[PDB]
Every structure is written in C-alpha cells, then in structure tokens.
From Swiss-Prot, chains A, B:
Designated name of the protein: 3C-like proteinase nsp5
Part of the intact protein present: 3264 to 3564 of 7096
Residues forming the catalytic site: 41, 142
Organism from which the protein derives: Severe acute respiratory syndrome coronavirus 2 (2019-nCoV)
Sites of the Glycyl lysine isopeptide (Lys-Gly) (interchain with G-Cter in ubiquitin) crosslink: 5, 87
Gene behind this protein: rep
Domain of life from the UniProt record: Viruses
Subunit structure as annotated in this protein's UniProt entry: 3CL-PRO exists as monomer and homodimer. Only the homodimer shows catalytic activity. Interacts with host FBXO22; this interaction promotes the proteasomal degradation of nsp5.
Effect the entry attributes to changing residue 87 to R: In strain: Beta/B.1.351
Mechanisms controlling activity: Inhibited by pyridone-containing alpha-ketoamides compounds 13a and 13b. In turn, alpha-ketoamide 13b (tert-butyl (1-((S)-1-(((S)-4-(benzylamino)-3,4-dioxo-1-((S)-2-oxopyrrolidin-3-yl)butan-2-yl)amino)-3-cyclopropyl-1-oxopropan-2-yl)-2-oxo-1,2-dihydropyridin-3-yl)carbamate) inhibits SARS-CoV-2 replication in human lung cells. Inhibited ex vivo by michael acceptor inhibitor N3. Inhibited ex vivo by compound 11a and 11b.
Function description: Cleaves the C-terminus of replicase polyprotein at 11 sites. Recognizes substrates containing the core sequence [ILMVF]-Q-|-[SGACN]. Cleaves and inactivates human TRMT1, preventing tRNA guanine(26)-dimethylation of tRNAs. May cleave human NLRP1 in lung epithelial cells, thereby activating the NLRP1 inflammasome pathway. May cleave human GSDMD, triggering alternative GSDME-mediated epithelial cell death upon activation of the NLRP1 inflammasome, which may enhance the release interleukins 1B, 6, 16 and 18. Also able to bind an ADP-ribose-1''-phosphate (ADRP).
Amino acid sequence: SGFRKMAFPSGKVEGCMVQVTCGTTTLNGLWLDDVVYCPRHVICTSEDMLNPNYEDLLIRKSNHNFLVQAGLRVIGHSMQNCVLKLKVDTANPKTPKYKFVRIQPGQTFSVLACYNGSPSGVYQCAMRPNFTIKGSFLNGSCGSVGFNIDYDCVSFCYMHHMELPTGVHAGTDLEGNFYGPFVDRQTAQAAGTDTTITVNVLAWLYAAVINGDRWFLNRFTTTLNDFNLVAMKYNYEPLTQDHVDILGPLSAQTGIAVLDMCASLKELLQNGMNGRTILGSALLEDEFTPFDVVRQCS
Amino acid sequence: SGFRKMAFPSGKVEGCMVQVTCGTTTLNGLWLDDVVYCPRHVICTSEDMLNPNYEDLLIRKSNHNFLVQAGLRVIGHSMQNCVLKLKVDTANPKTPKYKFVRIQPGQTFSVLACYNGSPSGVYQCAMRPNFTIKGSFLNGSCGSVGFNIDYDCVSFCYMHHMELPTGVHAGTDLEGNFYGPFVDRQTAQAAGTDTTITVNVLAWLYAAVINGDRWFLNRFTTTLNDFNLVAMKYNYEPLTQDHVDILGPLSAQTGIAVLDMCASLKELLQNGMNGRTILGSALLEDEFTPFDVVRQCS
C-alpha cells in the first residue's frame, strides 16, 4: 500500500536530451533519429522577442548558427509551428520507440527537467483545464519534455517554453502547437480561468479508500445532476457519464459505486475536512487520473 | 520558479533491475557487475517466515534453486546480513559508477518501484526519524532500491523488504542492515515514535519564499533555545547549530536569517495557516532536505 505521485522511469528519454545554443541563448533539445527538436524562440534575441517575425529571423539563420551538443553537426533547419527542427548528421543510437501525442486537459505526464542538455529530475504534472502546468522550471529549462510510457513506447506530449507571471508553466506539443492561448512573443499574456478536475479528485478518493483512508465515506448517494449543482458552486468541472465509465475499474476494485463517491465529495466540498487528512493531504488532490490510480494500485 | 517533489533521473538504475525467483516467491534484484543483490527472505516459505533460521535455510538451497531473469546463471550464493548475493556468470554491461551508502534519518532518496524486474515508477522518499519510509509498494516490490545521484555516481541506500501494519515501509541498506529495529521474521513489529524533521520544514519554508509564498514571514526572531521549547511541544526534532549551518546556502539565496525563519515556523505551529496554503499545501512539509531545495532552485 501507499499512494504517491510517481513519475515514469526516465531512462528512455534521458538518452534523447541534448544542448542547443544559438547566439547567447542555451536551451535543451530532443534528439530522435537525425532530428533535434527545440523551442523556436532559441533564434530570438530579447529585442526580437517583443515582435518576432519568425519566418524572417529563421531565413537569416544558417546551419552554423546552431551549436548542438550531446554529452552534432546541423545539416538542415526548419520550423514547424513553434518548434525548430534541426536535422543533424548523426541519428541518435539511443532513440527509443516513440510517438508524438497531443494530450487532453486533465491528463498527466512525467516531465524530465533538464539544463544544458543534462537531465536533473523527473516529476508528474497534469495538464490543467486552462492548459497550463504547475511544474518546476528555471531559466534554461526550455526544451525539457513531458511524456508517458505505454507498454514499450514513449509518447511525447509536451515541450517547455515559458513561465507565466502567475508562476505556472506553458509549452507546446512536439508538433509545436501551444497548449492554450499562449504565444512565443514577449507580450502580456494570461491563462484563462482554471477549474478543478472532478474525475481526478474522485480517482484520488478511490486511491484513498484502497490505501486505508475511508472516514469520508457515507451512506448517501446522489444523482449526477444534483452532484453537478455542487460542482458548479465550487468551480469543479461537470462530471459526465463518460467520467463515470472511466472510473469503472476503481469502482470494481473497491466495490464503491461512482455516485456514492460523488456524495462523499459533495460533503467534503461543503464542510471541509474538519482538521483531518486524506492520503497525507489537508486539501483535495486533482492531479491523478483514474488510470494513474489503477496503474499504481495494480 | 515552482517547487515540486522531484526524483533523480532513473536510467542508470533501470539497467540494473532483474527478477529473482525462488520457489513460489518472485521479487526484484539489483545486478551490479557479476552480483545480484536481493532480500534474503526470498528463500523462505510462509511457514519458514514465522521463525526462520536463515543460515540453515541457505545451506539447503543450491544455485539451481534461484531463477534470475534480466529482461542469468547463478554460480554462487551467499548472505550478508539480510541481503542475498547471487554471483552470476555474466557481468552487467549496464553497471553504472556506484557506491553503497547507509543514509541518515531525515535524508531523502529516489525509489525506483519495480515488479518482476521491470521498473514502474520513480518518486522521492525521506528516511523518517523512526527509520521507516512513506512510499508506494505492493506485493512483489521487494528488492526495489532507493538511491541518490551525486555528480556521475549512483549512491544506493535502500532496498525494500516490507510494509508495517501502520502502512509505512521498511528495508535495509545494500549491505543488508535494516534501517530501524525491524527484522525479516513474521513476528509482530512496530516502528518507534516518529517526529517532524525541523530542518526540512525550514528548508521548505525557504523554498516557499524563493517561489513567491511569503505571507508567513514576520518581523520577529527567536533564540535557538526558545524555538526548541516550541519544537518539543509540537513533536518537532530539536534544531541544532549544525542544522543552522546546513541551512546557510538558503539563508544566503533569500537574505533571511535562519532564526528569523524559526520565528515564522513558531507562529505556524501555534496558530496554523488560517485557511491559507504554502506551495500548494495546507500542512507543513518535512520531506525536502536543505540540499534538495538548493539543487532544485539552482
């Protein structure tokens, strides 16, 4: 027993991390086969960032303007949305089986935080409903990636680009499309309103029951519609029958019906914990998906 | 910015994990050079565990009684305290630069949770003052290891053996010596009284200030002796001048004197948070060492 925020083993991704330098800027790149992927803002100076014409700035750059270090001669350079793709003369012999996926809000992934092409740590993040993540990133961490491992395949889903002034993080998929409304320009930007990921809080209450914390259970049940009236008041996402179906494996492992767990969540929202804790927390946790609970508890 | 519980990159350790089976029992082993290390209780049946004479049980075993799978012929077997060392016919070609260290209570490490010799996840643990850890381990996770990475060397410090009925975990160093009073016998055992790791809570308050949470700061200071009268009342470890010295780098990064931070901790202990949070927590966190904060924030 025990329930912890757990990252995927990072070995397969560690062998893909390289350092990319353009001008005075140094950040990380992801080396897969003979291509190094990194944030396109690596080509910008601070003055360029105020109003960058990335097409014109990329035209001015040549292959020799990119210094790529793995522990690599750049033979081509191109841009795909907000990512730069540097074709190199050597295929990464450590390239794992991989896919690029654009993940949905509410889903989790592991981040391999890197500096100067060297991995420093690994931790889990959820993609918030407002398309930000709450991670740990300093200057130089750009190009660090988020991923999931499914069977024997690394699914890359995130590349780091920036921190918003609210202290949350933003970036793109590996095709260079930002998650959320964000742009790679030095202009005022703000994330939209966030909400709590209801299906994840229910998954974490199931994790709590599996791991011996049951005090919040009650004899009551609710309808999906009545629960959603409370979710709205507390800025929790509406729960759908699809969310109920996704929680099915947890309902079977514990024998507790999803709508019965919804009545527990209703009481916690309205009354709080009265000084008690759930899995070592005094607040409700929403960064574990139902699959995260199933995989960890199985 | 941002502050997260971060594990070390696990690649170097992933290549060392193997599966060890003896009789009906399957657990994990650590393969370094031509030796596989695992918990000696792998040789016991459930009846043997009630009162095992490990010396006699090991004498009855032969090399062919151990099935070692990496993804290995056992040519020798011996016991060192509570670890079994299976000499194998093949040196691990993925053996990293490593050391075996016995860590001190209050220190942290990364755990690579494994099942059937396959890594499943990685997360940080602190060795509690009562020599237990609060992890996530199921049946089959025995032999999973804890480690730190220092420069380019893996320092192994923990091997998993058991869960106590309070839901906390216990194990040994890589020389087979248990942390704490625990024994590998099926007899009633209980951890001693735990306490909160004061120097770690102060490190996490410094992490909070570095990351923008400053509401708990006040104009007051305390003496080390006056602070320790409050620490005693709240079951916090006494703070020493050595702890004050260890916090020096954090005091320099923030410009906040250690005894000034001790006055903040005193107010939090006596009055609580009044519904506020620190780094996304409604409780005081003690599983980050001062070095964990320095390495993550630098």
